[PDB]
Amino acid sequence: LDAELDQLLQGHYIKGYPKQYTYFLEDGKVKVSRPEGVKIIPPQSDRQKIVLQAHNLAHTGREATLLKIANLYWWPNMRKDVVKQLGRCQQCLITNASNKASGPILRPDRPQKPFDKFFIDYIGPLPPSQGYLYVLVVVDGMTGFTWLYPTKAPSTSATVKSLNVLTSIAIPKVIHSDQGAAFTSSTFAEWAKERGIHLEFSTPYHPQSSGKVERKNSDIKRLLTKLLVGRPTKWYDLLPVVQLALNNTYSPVLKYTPHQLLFGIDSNTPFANQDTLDLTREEELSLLQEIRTSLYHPSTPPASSRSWSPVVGQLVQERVARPASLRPRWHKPSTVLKVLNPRTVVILDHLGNNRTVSIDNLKPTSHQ
Amino acid sequence: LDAELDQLLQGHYIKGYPKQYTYFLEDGKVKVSRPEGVKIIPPQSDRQKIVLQAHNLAHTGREATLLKIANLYWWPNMRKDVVKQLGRCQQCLITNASNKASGPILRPDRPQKPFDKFFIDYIGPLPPSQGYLYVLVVVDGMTGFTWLYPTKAPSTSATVKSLNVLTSIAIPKVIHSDQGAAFTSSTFAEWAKERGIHLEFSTPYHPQSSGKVERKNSDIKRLLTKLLVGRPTKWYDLLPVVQLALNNTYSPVLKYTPHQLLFGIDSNTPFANQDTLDLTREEELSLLQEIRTSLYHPSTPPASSRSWSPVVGQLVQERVARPASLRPRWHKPSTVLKVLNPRTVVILDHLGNNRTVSIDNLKPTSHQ
Amino acid sequence: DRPQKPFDKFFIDYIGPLPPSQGYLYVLVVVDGMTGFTWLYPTKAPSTSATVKSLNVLTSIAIPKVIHSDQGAAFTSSTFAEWAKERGIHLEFSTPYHPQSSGKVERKNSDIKRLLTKLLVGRPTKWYDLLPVVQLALNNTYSPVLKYTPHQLLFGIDSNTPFANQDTLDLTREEELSLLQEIR
Amino acid sequence: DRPQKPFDKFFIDYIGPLPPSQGYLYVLVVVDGMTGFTWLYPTKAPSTSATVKSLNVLTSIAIPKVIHSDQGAAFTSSTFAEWAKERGIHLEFSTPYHPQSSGKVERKNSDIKRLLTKLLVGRPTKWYDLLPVVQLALNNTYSPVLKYTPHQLLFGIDSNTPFANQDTLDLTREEELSLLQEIR
DNA sequence: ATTGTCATGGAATTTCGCA
DNA sequence: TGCGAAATTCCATGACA
DNA sequence: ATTGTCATGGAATTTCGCA
DNA sequence: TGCGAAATTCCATGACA
Numbered sequence A, B: 001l002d003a004e005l006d007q008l009l010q011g012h013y014i015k016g017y018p019k020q021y022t023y024f025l026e027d028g029k030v031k032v033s034r035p036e037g038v039k040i041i042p043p044q045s046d047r048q049k050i051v052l053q054a055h056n057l058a059h060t061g062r063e064a065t066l067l068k069i070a071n072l073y074w075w076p077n078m079r080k081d082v083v084k085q086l087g088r089c090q091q092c093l094i095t096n097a098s099n100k101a102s103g104p105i106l107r108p109d110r111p112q113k114p115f116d117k118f119f120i121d122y123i124g125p126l127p128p129s130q131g132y133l134y135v136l137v138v139v140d141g142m143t144g145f146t147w148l149y150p151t152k153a154p155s156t157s158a159t160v161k162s163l164n165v166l167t168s169i170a171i172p173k174v175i176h177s178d179q180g181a182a183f184t185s186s187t188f189a190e191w192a193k194e195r196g197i198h199l200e201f202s203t204p205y206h207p208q209s210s211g212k213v214e215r216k217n218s219d220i221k222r223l224l225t226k227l228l229v230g231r232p233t234k235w236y237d238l239l240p241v242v243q244l245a246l247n248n249t250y251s252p253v254l255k256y257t258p259h260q261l262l263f264g265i266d267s268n269t270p271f272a273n274q275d276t277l278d279l280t281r282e283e284e285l286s287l288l289q290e291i292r293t294s295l296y297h298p299s300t301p302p303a304s305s306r307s308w309s310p311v312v313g314q315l316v317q318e319r320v321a322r323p324a325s326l327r328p329r330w331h332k333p334s335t336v337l338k339v340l341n342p343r344t345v346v347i348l349d350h351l352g353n354n355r356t357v358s359i360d361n362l363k364p365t366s367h368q
Numbered sequence C, D: 001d002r003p004q005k006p007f008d009k010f011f012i013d014y015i016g017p018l019p020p021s022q023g024y025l026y027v028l029v030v031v032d033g034m035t036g037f038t039w040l041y042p043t044k045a046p047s048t049s050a051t052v053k054s055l056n057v058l059t060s061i062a063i064p065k066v067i068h069s070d071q072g073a074a075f076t077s078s079t080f081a082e083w084a085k086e087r088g089i090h091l092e093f094s095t096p097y098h099p100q101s102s103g104k105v106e107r108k109n110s111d112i113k114r115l116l117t118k119l120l121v122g123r124p125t126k127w128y129d130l131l132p133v134v135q136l137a138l139n140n141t142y143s144p145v146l147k148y149t150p151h152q153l154l155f156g157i158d159s160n161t162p163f164a165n166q167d168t169l170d171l172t173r174e175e176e177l178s179l180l181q182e183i184r
Numbered sequence E, G: 001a002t003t004g005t006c007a008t009g010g011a012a013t014t015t016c017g018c019a
Numbered sequence F, H: 001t002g003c004g005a006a007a008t009t010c011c012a013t014g015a016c017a
């Protein structure tokens, strides 16, 4: 502060004030003649207030804050003090965007068997058709085989009615869903427990986690749209046709239709495949088991050049889910308790609860 | 058709039916023994109906259609006939997504002088503040200097009132806006003509075209949010502070604030720059002219590996603006009349009018 | 001649009238001939109309080449014939008064009737809700002749609901007395 | 001593009462000392309150180091002093009854009054709408002493509205007769 | 306590038909 | 033992509220 | 008849202070 | 004539309804 600047004026060396410049006095203020011009050196005890005043003008980041300060002042390692303030400005931390991308996505293993895992979701509201507004979509993880049910609401009751019909065929080990109201109710939880079905939930506000069914939603809507061109949007009577049409469509990368992955043989549909006509059912189920295991599986894509990956104890911030107008898009900093996988973590909020959260709804707190 | 298949059966060579395979008769149908098995060769006159039936099951693309057909049939160059049908399926053409990206963006030259070009836009609705709900934002192209006006509606009348106040300072050559209702009215057109101001409009539904002002909107909202943290969203009394705060914020890439680009000297604001204290105004305006011309200007980024660029006479399709539920996302094919620049074109719709359109709202029609 | 397959032949028939359950009175019974897999659909009548509506559900999952039935009115109607023609399904009728299926199907249809009868008694009006658990039972029941359940033959995997307790299927002394009381 | 600059000194003063225009009665006049640039703000009163409200508009564009005024009530109030202190603006008063500016400012203020007077006559109630065109005129008027308009000195560029017709600024015989009729 | 996916149609690469 | 062309595979693009 | 933009904060690169 | 560290520049990331 005042002591340091004193020793400086009488020509002695203080660490980080380069010796080759002349430090003088003028108007009660320590100054120095630097290449860009004459700048005031304030006492250390004044520096935090300066950095803060500069920063607060427009809540600027590193360089735009520094450029204001440098207009009047110089002192050793200015950016160190700028960055210190940025790391403490609650407003900047919860309002600013991140400039680090997520690490590359995981490609979870395809469920080993039909019925190992169902992915379920709702589509809608659609235009009213016979009183119906939504579609329950159930996709078998291994095969892609899909079941469609029209509903009047994305409700637990309609979910349970529909799944009682579906599970007449088989009971799945796990049902994966998003956190829609219909799937998270205790009624639905009971329904699953009664049947020994494990409920598995996506991390919140992260539809990629239901990617299997979401992607089928796309095809469902695309086909319905094409069949409805130049007609009123009477979609109810088409659900069955669409179900059957898609369950029997080839995946160019797999060379198999979801029906073939489920049954190992085409039913009486158009252009049925006949290659196993001479096999016994048993020989056929044998070839099916082989086909099921050898399916193409994608790998984790390359990371982007500026991704971040979560580390236990790191400060990170959860994205606000439905942020009000003119309100921050981020919650206050919180801590990574556990790294479940490189794209999923448990955080302590600061109130605080444990939340399991997608890395896509996180940014790493800036400036540590 | 029947003649061709006849000559084939009696062991003669027909072009595109490889000689090394034996073509026989069975159940009134021409057949052939191919590596994958025995397939029916239908008569040419039957092939279009087959391709169409296969395609229509789920309106599948090239491979997924082919894989159905190949289950029963073989003939020369099947995909040629598949692609022919895909190019004629109106439903697929207007429902499917594109899988070709736009060519890289243009970086238009920065307006040469302050007042050469204004970019204007509305932000809102915001939470009501003193009866106000919107903000008119006016950004000078060259300097980034910004003016803010609170309004009760994004209306022409409020636009005109606000701009009468602004143009008290200077009258701009060109005002660029998007196609918001307030800017496209004939009242506003008159207002501009009265003043010798040229009105310039973005292509429709393409906010990047107003990028200059849009990007300033971001900062405006970001600053307002930070200043409103833990307070009611009373933003009206902050517009002036925000205006002044931003007009005096440094752009780290330019090393200048919009105020400095406009005036060549800081006014009595905090941390005012003093480097030209010893220059005459004239020497100062001299250095300003030099600074204005030497500003960093970005270049067109590299094209993505699968971009398309428009060519005169090409069939392309305009994206539907607000597509209804279960309706196509694309209009019927239309033709490129003129390529205004590699990212902007004039098309004839097919009704049809001339539309000037962004390449981002176009896909090139598939299969020619 | 080619080996027998799932979807080669569905055998259909009605069971009922039954005591009302959620307004339902019959069960359309569908059995896959090769695998012995059973689909059950509750209906309000043994009509073509209810048959079409129910088979529309099943045939939006898998389509049989051949449907076999007796000469029930619902199955010999020209409407049902139209329906099947539309879908490329061949219809096949057993001669009147002489129902014939296969051993597998016959035995299956037997189990269905007996299992229904068993679980209805006590709760003759709550069968609509039990249809799912009935089908799981039937389709996860081991076939003495083949080493496999219908579930296994259809999907080529073990199931997540195996029915290890091969049940009595016969009415206990109480239930015979209760069944003869409900018939009073 | 350092050369004179824009924003070094703003000279402020009120003009009016004027005939009502959209409910307005005065014009707060602000002139940049170095450049001669003019900002005009219509007010309902020569009060501190109207002065603060108007200067808040201007000072959200640029802040003067020094504001110069006469000892008008609105400018000597402690509220106005508070306002200026808040913004780091030094206040500066000419002595009572002895108004002093600069030659440039004096001449500018002169032009303002004369140009106002001229365009009000005929339409003494429509001046509120004309304030913009007035300021453009003033700020695109060539300065005999300097080779440049205020626009040019402020922004360092030519303007898109040059006022090539250096106007009469004097009242024609008709207007003198009309002005003496409106004063009847 | 959990995790993206896959139809699509040009282009790149491999295979086929023939010699 | 290598050529032209057809067939197959590759894979970026975009959309699932 | 028109066309993306730029604050941000880690990382990469250059410059500084000293010898 | 080269070293360690500070300063500056680079630039991918994301958001403007």
Ligand SMILES: CN(c1c2c(c(O)c3ncccc13)C(=O)N(Cc1ccc(F)cc1)C2)S(C)(=O)=O
Pocket: A121, A122, A178, A179, A180, A181, A204, A205, A206, A207, A208, A211, A214, F016, F017
């Ligand atoms: C509005 N959100 C929701 C979405 C979906 C749901 O089914 C939801 N169900 C319940 C509640 C919220 C849901 C859904 O299908 N989405 C479309 C989608 C699919 C895949 C992608 F990669 C991107 C977007 C968004 S979200 C998850 O909060 O952003």
Ligand SMILES: CN(c1c2c(c(O)c3ncccc13)C(=O)N(Cc1ccc(F)cc1)C2)S(C)(=O)=O
Pocket: B121, B122, B178, B179, B180, B181, B204, B205, B206, B207, B208, B211, B214, H016, H017
């Ligand atoms: C809803 N659309 C509109 C937007 C904006 C307007 O100001 C509009 N004004 C009038 C009418 C429609 C407007 C606007 O600011 N956007 C935000 C934005 C900015 C830059 C980007 F790169 C992306 C998005 C969208 S749009 C153009 O149809 O998609």
Ligand SMILES: [Mg+2]
Pocket: A121, A122, A178, A180
């Ligand atoms: Mg959902």
Ligand SMILES: [Mg+2]
Pocket: A121, A122, A207, A214, A217
């Ligand atoms: Mg969804």
Ligand SMILES: [Mg+2]
Pocket: B121, B122, B178, B180
């Ligand atoms: Mg707009």
Ligand SMILES: [Mg+2]
Pocket: B121, B122, B207, B214, B217
């Ligand atoms: Mg906008």
Ligand SMILES: [Mg+2]
Pocket: C013, C014, C070, C072
């Ligand atoms: Mg019968």
Ligand SMILES: [Mg+2]
Pocket: D013, D014, D070, D072
């Ligand atoms: Mg006065």
Ligand SMILES: [N+]
Pocket: A107, A108, A109
């Ligand atoms: N996995």
Ligand SMILES: [N+]
Pocket: B107, B108, B109
């Ligand atoms: N340009």
Ligand SMILES: [Zn+2]
Pocket: A055, A056, A059, A060, A089, A091, A092, B226
């Ligand atoms: Zn801040």
Ligand SMILES: [Zn+2]
Pocket: A226, B055, B056, B059, B060, B089, B091, B092
């Ligand atoms: Zn189609």
